[PDB]
Structures are given as C-alpha cells and as structure tokens.
Amino acid sequence: PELPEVETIRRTLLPLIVGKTIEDVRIFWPNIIRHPRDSEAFAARMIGQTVRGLERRGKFLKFLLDRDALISHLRMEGRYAVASALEPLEPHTHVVFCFTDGSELRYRDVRKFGTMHVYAKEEADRRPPLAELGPEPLSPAFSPAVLAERAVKTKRSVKALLLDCTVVAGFGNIYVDESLFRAGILPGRPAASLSSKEIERLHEEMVATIGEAVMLYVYGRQGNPCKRCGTPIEKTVVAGRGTHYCPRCQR
DNA sequence: GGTAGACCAGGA
DNA sequence: CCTGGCTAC
Ligand SMILES: [Zn+2]
C-alpha cells in the first residue's frame, strides 16, 4: 500500500476498532515484531489496553492504545481486517489482536515484510521507525525551501532524494516517477543540479500527484506511448529501483 | 556524516 | 528478480 492507501486504511479501520479492549495477542511469524525484540513481551504488554486512536505518519500506521503506541508498516502487501474469532483464519495471517468482544484485528502479509514496533506513546516519535521521518508531503512543513536545502547538499540523484524517508515521509516509487514526469525532470538527474525553478516545479507536482491520489503517465508503462507526446516510455534502474520516464519530455 | 550495501521472503 | 526502511566503508 502507498501513502494514499494507508490514509484510507487509517480512516476506515479506526471506527472498527476504537474502544475495543485487547484480551490476547497471537503471533504466528515472530520476525514481524521488531520491538520489544521478544514477541512474548510484545504480546504481554498489549493485553488489557483499549484502542483509543489511529494515526498515520508517512506510510506508517500508529495505533494509539492506553499507554502504548503500536507502529505498523505494511510494506508491499500487508493488510488489516476486523472479523469474528469464531471464523477460520485466512491464509498468511501472521498477527492477531483478540478483543474482549469476540472480534479480532488480523494482520495478513503474504510477503512477511511488514513490521511492528510497540513503545510507550511518548517515546514512539523518538524511536525507530518514526524517529528520523521527514515532513508529510501534504503539509506546509514540506516546502520548496526544505526540498532545495536537501537537494544542494547531496551527490545523489533526484529520485534517490525523493525516496529518502528523511527528506519527505512515505513518498513511494510510483509517485516519485509520476511526479518527475509531471515536472519534466529526468529521475537520474543529480539532485544538486536542479534549478530553483525546477525545485519549485517538482514540489508543486509532488503535492498535486499525491494530493490527487489521497483525495498513470509512466509507472509500469514501459514500451507504451507517452500519453503526452507518444514517445515510448522507457524503464531503467535508478537508485536501485525500477524507474520509468519519457525521454522526450523529461530533461 | 554520507552513502552504498545487506537484509528479509514469496510469487513470477 | 523486485522491494521499504541496520551495518560498515
Ligand atoms: Zn512524452
């Protein structure tokens, strides 16, 4: 799930779990649990706490309980569902939170790449994985000035810069390629080579692209005609990722 | 201090 | 082979 999908999960999942009290936590793939390191301590500490809220930071979900926060990243295929404890579990269910009302919050992840960290609420923002997280892309805290400052002080590509969670929170591969196309900038350009005008343009397209999605031109379209000029879209590797662009319209 | 690289783990 | 967000040059 990308940022807009995580925002949808946050909004839709909250009313399905708010006010429920945890009676048990069952873990079927302990590697998902990253803090406490011991999955038995993770399960034990959550028992007896009631769900009070659900927030999002980048692509992280922050479940707010009584004393603790549970910070969850779904990576590529993680999914949450609420259902009855009476029914058989679906495949790839790796963590289940059992509530006192006989319902459960189930975490499924065929890839097993997702992560869970639990800390006292007041500690969560200063611990992994939230600690060094950059500003929300749709917030005033993410500005052209902030982007420009990061761009000039790196030798990396502009794509590598945008994928960096410390620069801007949760801006995924798909939106990086789409935004760069909409801004007319090649993904392999050194970040430090962007002009002031290019940085402002890029900022505007990043906000427009992810904003529209929260409320495709190139991604996955290799070999197909550009929707703007008809030139076939190309795919290469940039910043170690599949990268799509129009070689005519991006410079 | 920056930055590349390892790392995870299963469906094509 | 692709992929989001602790180690070691
Ligand atoms: Zn084009």
Residues in helices, as a percent range: 25-40%
Bound molecules: zinc ion
The top level CATH class name of the largest domain: Alpha Beta
Order of helices and strands: HEEHEEEEEEEHHHHHEE
Distance between the termini: 30 Å
Largest sheet: 5 strands, mixed
Beta-strand content estimate: 15-25%
* Rg, Å, rounded: 20 Å
CATH H-level name of the largest domain... which superfamily?
A: MutM-like, N-terminal
Biggest sheet: strand arrangement? 2-9-5-4-3
Do you know the CATH topology of the largest domain?
A: N-terminal domain of MutM-like DNA repair proteins
Question: How many separate domains?
Answer: 2
Give the overall shape. elongated
**Count of helical segments?**
7
How does the helix and strand content classify structurally?
A: alpha+beta
Question: Which architecture of the largest domain per CATH?
Answer: Alpha-Beta Barrel
Number of strands: 11
PDB class: hydrolase/dna
Keywords: DNA repair, damage search, disulfide crosslinking, DNA damage, hydrolase, HYDROLASE-DNA complex
Assembly: trimeric
Entry title: MUTM Interrogation complex 6
What is the gist of this entry?
The chain has helices at residues 3-17, 39-46, 121-124, 144-152, 158-162, 173-183, 196-214, and strands at residues 22-27, 33-35, 53-57, 60-64, 68-73, 79-84, 93-99, 103-108, 115-120, 234-238, 241-245.
Strand and helix layout:
Blueprint lengths: L2 H15 L4 E6 L5 E3 L3 H8 L6 E5 L2 E5 L3 E6 L5 E6 L8 E7 L3 E6 L6 E6 H4 L19 H9 L5 H5 L10 H11 L12 H19 L19 E5 L2 E5 L6
Parallel strand pairs: 2-9
Antiparallel strand pairs: 1-7, 3-4, 4-5, 5-9, 6-8, 7-8, 10-11
Helix pairs in contact: 1-7, 4-7, 6-7
The site of zinc ion has 7 residues, from loops.
This protein binds a DNA duplex (12 and 9 nucleotides) through loops.
